Design a protein around this ligand. Structure first.
Ligand SMILES: CN1N=C(C(=O)O)[C@@H]2[C@@H](C(=O)O)NC[C@@H]21
Ligand SMILES: [Cl-]
Ligand SMILES: [Cl-]
Ligand SMILES: [Cl-]
Ligand SMILES: [Zn+2]
Ligand SMILES: [Zn+2]
Ligand SMILES: [Zn+2]
Length: 250
């Protein structure tokens, strides 16, 4: 049977490809994670149907501990694979399985160009420049859970001021372009955006380190096969090639 792949529109990972007509099925999509999926389907010899996650979320918990997003789709066995920039986290590992990472990254800062700012520290110890993160994203959770001084402080700011947190990267990137606002997000998106928007830039370096993995329901037989396939793609340099294909723009 074809595998059900849950995913989520997110540049440059998964996008509707441009067309004069209306496309349907898998042919609708293009992007880094679509190329990854094609590589995985070939190596492992499965067929698949792409389905965008209904609630358009990656996956977070509520106060009662219930999951939404692609994480939930896997938990309920409504999808066999999550092929997306799904950040590997301690908490998510308790609910689903991940392949080994296919991409490594970290939290960093998106901000308009040309300022005294050079680091998170510069950002926390001042007040003129607002800053925030996507609400309930892996990046926000990092600041919430942190015990580091400068990040407990930043979490204090972004959690008190109820305009600091944005609904998604799209809105957050809007804010950096219209207001005096710095977005806390993942370095993969920042590199993509700053290659295409020469008025934006990354502030400082990576403040943590993490990876993206293919999500499967806990105990899936495919997890280990996907890990083997990712290792093969690494050996063949195809993750390098795929990244340069979809990260290119100053
Ligand atoms: C592009 N994204 N940025 C994020 C962030 O948390 O900064 C999200 C994270 C997740 O899986 O929650 N990885 C994909 C999303
Ligand atoms: Cl076409
Ligand atoms: Cl769909
Ligand atoms: Cl999370
Ligand atoms: Zn190949
Ligand atoms: Zn089941
Ligand atoms: Zn290479």
């Amino acid at each position: 049977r074809s595998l059900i792949v849950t995913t989520l529109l997110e540049e440059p990972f998964v996008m509707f490809r441009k067309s004069d007509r209306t496309l349907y099925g898998n042919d609708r999509f293009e992007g880094y994670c679509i190329d990854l999926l094609k590589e995985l389907a070939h190596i492992l010899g499965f067929s698949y149907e792409i389905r965008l996650v209904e609630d358009g979320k990656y996956g977070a918990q509520d106060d009662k501990g219930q999951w939404n997003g692609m994480v939930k789709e896997l938990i309920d066995h409504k999808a066999d694979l999550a092929v997306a920039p799904l950040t590997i986290t301690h908490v998510r590992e308790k609910a689903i399985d991940f392949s080994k990472p296919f991409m490594t990254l970290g939290v960093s800062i998106l901000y308009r160009k040309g300022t005294p700012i050079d680091s998170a520290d510069d950002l926390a110890k001042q007040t003129k420049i607002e800053y925030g993160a996507v609400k309930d994203g892996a990046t926000m959770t990092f600041f919430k859970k942190s015990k580091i001084s400068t990040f407990e402080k930043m979490w204090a700011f972004m959690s008190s001021k109820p305009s600091a947190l944005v609904k998604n990267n799209e809105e957050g990137i809007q804010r950096t372009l219209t207001a005096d606002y710095a977005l806390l997000m993942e370095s993969t998106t920042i590199e993509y955006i700053t290659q295409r928007n020469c008025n934006l830039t990354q502030i400082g370096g990576l403040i943590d380190s993490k990876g993206y993995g293919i999500g499967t329901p806990m105990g899936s037989p495919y997890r280990d096969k996907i890990t083997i396939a990712i290792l093969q793609l690494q050996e063949e340099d195809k993750l390098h090639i795929m990244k340069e294909k979809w990260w290119r723009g100053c």
